[PDB]
Amino acid sequence: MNIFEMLRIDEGLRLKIYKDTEGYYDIGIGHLLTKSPSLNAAKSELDKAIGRNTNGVITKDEAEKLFNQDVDAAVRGILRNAKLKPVYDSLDAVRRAALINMVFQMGETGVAGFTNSLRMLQQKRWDEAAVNLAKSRWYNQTPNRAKRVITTFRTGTWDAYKNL
Ligand SMILES: [Cl-]
Ligand SMILES: [Cl-]
Predict the structure, then answer these.
(1) 17: helix, coil or strand?
(2) The dihedral of CA 64, 69, 75, 78: what is its sign?
(3) Which strands, in side-by-side order, build the sheet including 14-19?
(4) Is 159 a catalytic residue?
(5) C-alpha distance across the termini of the chain, in Å
(6) Which of 24, 43, 47, 67 would staple 29 via disulfide (CB 3.0–4.6 Å)?
(7) 104 among annotated binding-site residues
(8) Coil, strand, or helix at residue 144?
(9) Residue 60 and residue 19: Cα distance in Å, rounded?
(10) How far apart are CA 30 and CA 20, in angstroms?
């Protein structure tokens, strides 16, 4: 299992513009196009992202390309963020993948806001961090997904994902 495989399980794969859990427009493997309510705004961002008149549809390759850019950007965003980098550098490989998952999902800014949890993770207080992470809108909105990432941070293993 690796980050790619992990996120591909959590986000799925759709080749046509779709609404995410929050009502925004995405395409591919959780690639956010626009937060705006217009399908046109979305088709426009989409063609601009792919570099061609897509007409709301892309291929698998195209989806994977966006995905690759999105993971890379997540990592790069963690590394340039003053609150995140330290956390990330203190973690083992599996748990680093759990932090990238939350960043890809919610943005660097969103994550950096989990101040108390970040500190606990940094301290290696697994169970405490898990309980703290759970007290969030994130967990309440997408509990199944949240449970997987939290277990990942709690255990340092890919158990929540083996079987999927
Ligand atoms: Cl893009
Ligand atoms: Cl969920």
Answers:
(1) strand
(2) negative
(3) 14-19, 25-28, 31-34
(4) no
(5) 11
(6) 67
(7) yes
(8) helix
(9) 18
(10) 8
The backbone torsions φ and ψ at residue 142, rounded to the nearest 5 degrees and listed phi first, read: -135, 70
What distances in angstroms separate CA 123 from CA 66, 95, 119, 150, 151, one per listed residue?
34, 13, 6, 16, 17
Q: Give me the resolution in angstroms, 1 decimal.
A: 1.9
Cα 39 from Cα 31, distance rounded (Å): 15
CB 42 within 8 A of CB 17: yes
Region label for 163, one of left (φ > 0), alpha (ψ between -120 and 50) or beta (otherwise): left
Q: Which two tokens stand for residue 143?
A: 């509990």
The CATH architecture assigned to 1-164 reads Orthogonal Bundle (1.10)
**Cα 131 to ligand 1 centre (Å):** 35
DSSP code string of 52-109: S--SSB--HHHHHHHHHHHHHHHHHHHHH-TTTHHHHHHS-HHHHHHHHHHHHHHHHH
Residue 98 Cα to ligand 1 midpoint, Å, equals: 23
Solved how?
X-ray
**From the CA of 137, how far away is ligand 2's center (Å)?**
12
Strand partners, 31: 27
